[PDB]
Amino acid sequence: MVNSMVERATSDMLIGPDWAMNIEICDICNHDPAQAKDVVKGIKRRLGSKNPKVQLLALTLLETIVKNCGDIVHMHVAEKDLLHEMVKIVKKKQPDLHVKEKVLILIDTWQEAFGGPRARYPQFYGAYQELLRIGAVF
Amino acid sequence: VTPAKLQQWLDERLPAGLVFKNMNLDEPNIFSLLHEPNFAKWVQYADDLSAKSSHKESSVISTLTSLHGDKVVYDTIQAAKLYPQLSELALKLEKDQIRFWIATRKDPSVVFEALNLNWAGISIFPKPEFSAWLKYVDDVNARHPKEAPLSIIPTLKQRFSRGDEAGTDVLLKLIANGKATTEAKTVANKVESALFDFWLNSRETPDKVMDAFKYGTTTQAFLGSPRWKEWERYLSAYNARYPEKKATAIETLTRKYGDAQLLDTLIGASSKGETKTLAAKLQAQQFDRWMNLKESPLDVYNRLRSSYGDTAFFNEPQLNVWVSYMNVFVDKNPSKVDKMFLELGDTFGDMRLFRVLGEAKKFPNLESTATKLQMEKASTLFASGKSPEGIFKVLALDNVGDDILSNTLFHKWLAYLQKFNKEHPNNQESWFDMLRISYQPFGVERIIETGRKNPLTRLMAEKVENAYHNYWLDIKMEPKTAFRSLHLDESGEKLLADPKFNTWVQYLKTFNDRYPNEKTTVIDGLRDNSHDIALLRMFSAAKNDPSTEKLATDLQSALILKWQDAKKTPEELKRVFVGVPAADEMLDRYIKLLAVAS
């Protein structure tokens, strides 16, 4: 089902992100919150790929759905510890530099956007503070 | 799979890209893809989906560009236009791709590349694709008024050279020749406006921007160019946008290069016709700055010592310009003119002061008070009873130049020399020697030429001319050498008509009188400097001038005498001449003389 969309939207066969496909996914997430669960779960899996291109595509999709779709997805993202995996990407000895830059920008955006420690999903801020403890800078 | 499955999927709002892959539209070749009828059905799906998706724009394009990159898509659509049954679709696709690009704020560089503006180089402006590219930029900005605007300029710079300044140089060239043709002129003006806006929006200072206009050239050359005015136009534009940071040209120039180099450049520019006008203007403004800062001339000297021209301050030209500031300074401060020069006097050695004062006399504001102190100092020096040699140097007479014979100090110094020489009969000094040493032979020569031309100096100039020739006697300069010394070698056919020829004859005589043992004839002197055939060409010419005719004939005889002394055979002479004026006359004469001798 939905996993197919995610996989294709994050396939190594793309040279660039299919933004229209990303938006189309956003639309269905606004229609069907059940499907939205499955989307974010798929993204986690694809982030788990070795391939930095796949990772970038996944990050870019994630950026899109986060900005576009409703609170359910935000809840899923936090609750499925997706953030923890993202942290773990940065924790690599030799991470990809573009990936690293992308995650940093995203997490900085989000912890601000959600209101930091008083965020109803404080996980965003938690991840950001973990990063700060290692001495990362955007 | 079926239209039913598609309608199902449409109800389910499946993403276009997934449907593509479900359709196995992963064809191996992009150019093939558009021929599959299946692809068209997918287009319809994608359109119908777009009608109820959030995005207006063509998901198709998004899909395809995401697989292949923008250029490849565009080129593929252009390839699709060929087959006319695909034409209607291909033109829809082109429109859609544009819509897509505009919506997605795609970077102008990608559009430029996709348009194959690779080609144009010289002729970017007339080409319709380039026009379309500007249209794209304007359209994008129109759709996106909230965002910071996009610009052409980075694309252009980065393409033509990998250097901020250097790329901009070619752009400026292209703008300039675009303006000249009526065809490109409109386009050229838009490009210019964009470049300007780019600098303004990037807040690039006039100082920085100047480096662009200066590129390729010497500092000097930039000022002579059209580009100077163009950069002034930028400066004025910059000041308008950011009046809190307002700057004028000279201020800007000062802060970029510092006063010393600026001054040096203004000196250079003031010498040359192209720049002279504004060199002077900018120079005056530089003075005006120092005046508004209430900097005394000596304060200004302090400032400027500390880089370039201190070692090269006291010489021409730098000094002259300093004195020009002094003139202006006293025009604003007449009261303190005495105090100024007095301070110079205690600060510097007398010879330096003299050097100043010589120049100061040229300037009306200074002339009187300068003349006064010049004489006061001079009088003191005369009263000392020191050597004329020493005094000459202290008076800076070595740096008066060609018109020294007009100079009041030089005359006063002569008077001292004569008094001194009477009072020191055992230890006399030569005026001429001082002139010779200090101005070198070539300077002496110019001095004579200058002093002859002015009637007031003429007698003095004759005295000097004599002394120079006397020196030639004292050093035993051979008349052969003296001929070249007077550049008689240059006078060509007309040598005998040359006034200086006569002078050289008279020197040669005087030399013979001093040195009878090595006595030399005019004709021998002529023979040393040139060969017979040139000489009788000159003689045949000289016979045409009555004033020289007699001379010519005498020399013809004197030449013949030398052939006799040389024991030359007429055959040798006949052989070596061919088609030569007066040859046969002179041969026949020599032949006749040979007969009488035989």
Numbering used by the authors:
A (entry chain C): 1 to 138
B (entry chain A): 78 to 675
Can you list sentences taken from the study reporting this PDB entry?
We previously reported that the potato late blight pathogen, *Phytophthora infestans* deploys an effector AVRcap1b which can also suppress immune signaling and cell death mediated by NbNRC2 and NbNRC3. The 678 amino acid effector AVRcap1b is a core *P. infestans* effector in the RXLR-LWY family. NbTOL9a belongs to the Target of Myb 1-like (TOL) family of proteins, which are presumed to function as ubiquitinated cargo adaptors in the endosomal sorting complex required for transport (ESCRT) vesicle trafficking pathway. We found that AVRcap1b suppresses immunity by bridging the activated form of the helper NLR NbNRC2 and the host ESCRT pathway protein NbTOL9a.
The crystal structure revealed that AVRcap1b binds the ENTH domain of NbTOL9a via its WY1 and LWY2 regions and adopts a previously uncharacterized L-shaped fold (**[Fig fig2]**). Comparisons with PSR2 indicate that the bend in AVRcap1b arises from the LWY5 domain, which introduces a 77° angle in the protein backbone, producing the L-shaped conformation (**[Fig figs2]**). Four variants, AVRcap1b^P92E^, AVRcap1b^G94E^, AVRcap1b^S139E^, and AVRcap1b^S143E^, lost any detectable interaction with NbTOL9a, consistent with their contribution to the crystal structure interface (**[Fig fig5]**). The R90E variant which exhibited weak association to NbTOL9a was still capable of suppressing NbNRC2-mediated cell, although not to the same extent as WT AVRcap1b (**[Fig fig5]** and **[Fig fig5]**). These results indicate that AVRcap1b binding to NbTOL9a is required for full suppression of NbNRC2-mediated immunity and confirm the functional relevance of the interaction surface identified in the co-crystal structure.
